[PDB]
Amino acid sequence: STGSATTTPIDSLDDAYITPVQIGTPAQTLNLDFDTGSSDLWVFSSETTASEVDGQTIYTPSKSTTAKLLSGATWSISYGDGSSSSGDVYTDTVSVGGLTVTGQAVESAKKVSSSFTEDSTIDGLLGLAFSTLNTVSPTQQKTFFDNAKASLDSPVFTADLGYHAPGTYNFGFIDTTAYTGSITYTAVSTKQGFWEWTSTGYAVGSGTFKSTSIDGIADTGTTLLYLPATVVSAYWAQVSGAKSSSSVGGYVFPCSATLPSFTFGVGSARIVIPGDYIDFGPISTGSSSCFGGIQSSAGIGINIFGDVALKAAFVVFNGATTPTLGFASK
């Protein structure tokens, strides 16, 4: 079996991408944020504190003939940005782009933090990291991808994110029309539950490539690119007037500047991020200070190849017994 679904940016800055997902019988369609940095599938629902729902589409298990309460199971999750949610658990049928899993754990939110309430375009998250990070207790649950693996033609999914435009998540096959050149595969470590890999170096603009190992994670759920302070300082040093701002919490630059590209290494291959991808616009409406798309990971503890990096490539998440990550230009 295979599945294929279109993913669409939620706003003009590509702050996140939503993908339609069918839950229950008859189908209830919710727009979920596919997140390779977590492993919970959770949704706004009829059980969510009404105070904390502001325009989201909610899942109503009582209207699904295939929904079943997973008795005694609870979940609770906090993300790197300090947001959080918790609730109870149903199993139900879940389909993504024609690919159907029966008995998928659907985590129903009773409480959500303010960030989620404020974002009216995101009805929940679909986690695609490794199932060891799933927060359901006392019985840990498997991700959608792990449940689908048996039935997939090939145990892979691919992320083809667009720059200010729709893209595609595919399950079970590699679309050889979607990329140019060859795919470079690199080893993954599962020790922390993430799609963790080692980049082989970087270059700023047309400068010379610096060979140095950068351990990081491929995270579709994180907007920006977070790298070590040395690398990030080297990038912003090339932008006239760019500075790190404590009040804003990161590097900002004059909106009048043109940004250099950023290259990262995958084995012997090179992925180039166009400078325009790094512009996240004015810090406030009408400001001449713009927010940068490359930021320091020093306050985080892990380097994150988020959407800014991943949208520049065709990315293969290979969940074979020895997992690997593949990158190709497009």
Active site residues: 35, 199
Please, what is the Cα angle at 64 between 58 and 68, to 5 degrees? 100
Give burial (CB, 10 Å; 0-12/13-18/19+) of 230.
exposed
Burial of 20 (0-12, 13-18, 19+ CB in 10 A): middle
Q: How far is CA 123 from the centre of its chain?
A: 15
254 membership: H or E segment, kind and range: strand 250-254
Q: How many CA atoms lie within 13 A of 139 on its CB side?
A: 10
State the sign of the Cα–Cα–Cα–Cα dihedral 192, 131, 187, 294.
Answer: negative
End-to-end CA distance of the chain: 26
In angstroms, rounded to a whole number, what is the distance separating the alpha carbons of residues 3 and 171? 5
Report the amino acid identity of residue 16.
Answer: A
Q: Catalogue the long-range contacts made by 194-197 (C-beta closer than 8 Å, 24 or more residues apart).
A: 194/37, 194/129, 194/130, 194/133, 194/218, 194/219, 194/302, 195/36, 195/129, 195/130, 195/219, 195/317, 195/323, 195/325, 197/325
Rounded Cα distance between 264 and 83, Å, is 29
168, HSE (Cβ side, Cα atoms, 13 Å): 15
Quick one: tokens of 35? 């997140």
